[PDB]
Amino acid sequence: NSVSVDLPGSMKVLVSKSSNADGKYDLIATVDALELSGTSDKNNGSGVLEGVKADASKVKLTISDDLGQTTLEVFKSDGSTLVSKYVTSKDKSSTYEKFNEKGEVSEKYITRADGTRLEYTGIKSDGSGKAKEVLKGYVLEGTLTAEKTTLVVKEGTVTLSKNISKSGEVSVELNDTDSSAATKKTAAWNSGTSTLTITVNSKKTKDLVFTSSNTITVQQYDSNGTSLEGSAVEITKLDEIKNALK
């Protein structure tokens, strides 16, 4: 009788074919061996299901009315304080939060629809912590504050800093402590094309593009310092970022 419904977060729910005396639909799901059950105002698989872990932690699956989003929460055994929260949004990106004993977020993992990730760990009560961005082929490491995430790559006397603001705005900066004017790198950020242009000895040398696909490409200028040459090459490993900073 029941109807199988496909959900965000690689889950399924079964909804009863017909409603009960009160007009409500029965829901059942199995999530990693745990059986969850509930009732709903709707007939489409949306609503709330509940169950428990083998250790008695409470589990709740909340499916939005239009099936666009799902939330899977684990609580302490009386249901009072959150232990974890896993939200899959309608783009199929997800956020996974883990909580400490006061229900404060201690870890947060954002997985973008393209599979790249931001990982925030050791989060303190001021929203500071450790940060990593997991890209295809490499990882960038740095820190989190309530103002921004800053991911850092060092090569020689050059420090490249990728900033992601609290509101998600990306900007990149480069600072070089090199004391020789012949070799010191400087760079300008163009928010219009998400491009960092490096200069050495008063000529543009490279464009580093931080793409909307969460990749980085590098392209050199001609010796004239004004026209690009060749074609942009996608970075595949951290070592290649370091090479671009030489």
Structure method = X-ray
- What's the topology of domain 101-246? Outer Surface Protein A; domain 3 (3.90.930)
Listed residue (73, 94, 95, 92) closest to 84, CA to CA: 73
Please provide residue 241's backbone torsions phi and psi, each rounded to the nearest 5 degrees. -65, -50
Start-end of CATH 2.40.128.160 domains in the chain: 1-100
Q: For the chain, how many helices (H) and strands (E)?
A: 1, 21
- What's the topology of domain 1-100? Lipocalin (2.40.128)
- Resolution (in Å) of the shown entry? 1.3
How many C-beta neighbours within 10 Å does residue 233 have? 13
CA–CA distance, 192 with 206 (Å, rounded to integer): 17
CA–CA distance, 236 with 80 (Å, rounded to integer): 45
CA–CA distance, 13 with 38 (Å, rounded to integer): 10
